[PDB]
Every structure is written in structure tokens, then in C-alpha cells.
Amino acid sequence: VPRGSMILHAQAKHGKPGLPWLVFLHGFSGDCHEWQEVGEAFADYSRLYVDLPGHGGSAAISVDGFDDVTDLLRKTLVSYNILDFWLVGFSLGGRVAMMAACQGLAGLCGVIVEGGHPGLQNAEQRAERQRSDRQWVQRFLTEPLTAVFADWYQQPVFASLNDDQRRELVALRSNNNGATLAAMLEATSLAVQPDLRANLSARTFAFYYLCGERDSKFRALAAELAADCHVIPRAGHNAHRENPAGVIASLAQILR
Ligand SMILES: [Cl-]
Ligand SMILES: [Cl-]
């Protein structure tokens, strides 16, 4: 997909005529396949597996911030003539879903966020996240992805995984490019995101949170939100990966 393309790369699967679209957004280092094992259990719905800037088929697409991401995501929906849709976003894709929904997405039915940070409480928290993400960026601009992702999947957010799940994940995310990953990590960093709580509290849309039972970090952040939380048993931060069945049951509760 060209570097100057106005619409993001995505894989579409049509469903029943009367049903809305399920627009799936992956997390950092993922691609449009991420939500496919869970999404393909909702064959009645039309499904849109979007590749975010610096990821998958949208890897040549460089963005400055959430403003560019939202604009591109909006234009991508116009491309598939999507008028009624759900934004289902995981972690980074979760943050791009709340950031986009909060700045107007004509035709949104609701936003389903899985382990997506609503935003840091202040500028002091953001300044220290900038510091941290700049170190991460530097590793993605100098080391083989295999070596970077080994330490990536060792962060306290992934503590609940075993070495075999990590090795499987490290190998999968290596199928990327550190230069585009580092630009998208910097352009949509949590250090540049505002605290979206007051907007989510005054939201015009429907909002639903999913969390892995072992994801203590994002379970605590969800408790602060006036949205239903669906805690997924025997799963960590990536609940749709560890417990596809658990997450399918949560989506049915919400949609059907
Ligand atoms: Cl992951
Ligand atoms: Cl697994």
C-alpha cells in the first residue's frame, strides 16, 4: 500500500444485510490477523480487519499523531461505505478507538476496548512515559526486532505469560520493521495522549471494556471507568489470544 495512501490497508468480510460492521484494530507490533480468530465467530456481522500506520499493509504510512490516525481511519470507513459500525480495539488499537470516537465518528454504534489505557492522570506521568518510550524507540531504530521483542514481552504488563507463549509472540512480532514501528510508537505514544476520562464520562456513544483476568494493570484502570468491564478468565493483557472462547462470549453479551 503506498506511503502517501489516504486509506489504511484492511481485510473485509461481509455478513448479514441488517447487521453493523465490526471494525477491528490491533495493538503495537500486531496486524489485521490479530482479531481474526475471534472476529470469524461473528460471521453474521460484516468484519473489517484494519492495519494501523507502521503495521502490516499500512507499514509505509507515517503519521504525526492521533489526528492523522483518526483522519485515515475515518477515510478508510468511507472507502468500504461503512455507515453503522462498532470500533473493537486492542491495547494501542483501543487507544486509537477512544481517541477517534471522542473526536467524532459519524455512524459509530459503540466502542469495545480491550486493555486500552484511557490516559495518564497528568503531565508529570506523560513526561516520564515520553522518557520511557524514547528508550524503546531507540532500541527499535538500532536492534534486531527479535532482540527488542524479547525484552518487550518481559514488561510487567506481560508477566503472566510463560516462556513458550513469549517465544511464539517474539517470533510473530519480528515480522515487522523497527523504523515504522518506532515512528508509530512515537506518533501515538501514551505520553502524547490526553486523559480521556472526562470525555468517556460525557460520551454520546456506547462504551464497553474487556480485560484479561491476569491483567491487574488494565483491570485497575477499568474500575475508574463508568463502562461495563468483561473480565476474561485465564488470560493476560492479550485476552483475545489466550482465551478466544472467553472473549467471543463477552462480545455476544454486548452485541447479540
Ligand atoms: Cl501482544
Ligand atoms: Cl496461548
Residue numbers in the entry: -4 to 251
Paper lines:
MenH is thus correctly annotated as SHCHC synthase. As is characteristic of the α/β-hydrolases the three catalytic triad residues (Ser86, His232, Asp210) are located on loops of the core α/β–domain.
Accordingly, we report the structure of the MenH from E. coli at 2.75 Å resolution, along with the structures of two active site mutant enzymes, Arg124Ala and Tyr85Phe, both at 2.5 Å resolution. Structural comparisons of native EcMenH with the two mutant structures, R124A and Y85F using SSM shows they overlay very closely, with rms differences of 0.26–0.61 Å in Cα-atom positions over the entire structure. This shows that the mutations do not affect the polypeptide conformation significantly. In addition, 5–6 residues of the N-terminal His6 tag could be modeled for two of the chains in all the I4122 structures and in all chains of the Tyr85Phe C2 mutant structure. The Tyr85 aromatic ring is packed between the side chains of Ser86 and His235, while its OH group is hydrogen bonded to a water molecule and the catalytic His232 (a C-H…O bond), and interacts with the bound chloride ion (3.1–3.3 Å). For the Y85F mutant, the contact between the succinyl carboxyl group and the phenolic oxygen of Tyr85 is necessarily lost, with the carboxyl group then being positioned closer to Tyr148 OH and Trp147 NE than in the other structures; it is consistently hydrogen bonded to both. In our EcMenH structures, the indole NH of Trp147 and the OH of Tyr85 are ∼7.5 Å apart, well placed to bind the succinyl carboxylate between them, as shown in the docking studies. Mutation of either one of them may not compromise binding, especially as other residues such as Tyr148 and Arg168 could then become involved, but such mutations could compromise productive binding, thereby affecting catalysis. If, as suggested, substrate binding is required before the catalytic triad can become active, Tyr85, which binds to both substrate and His232, could play a key role in activation of catalysis. The structure is not perturbed by the mutations.
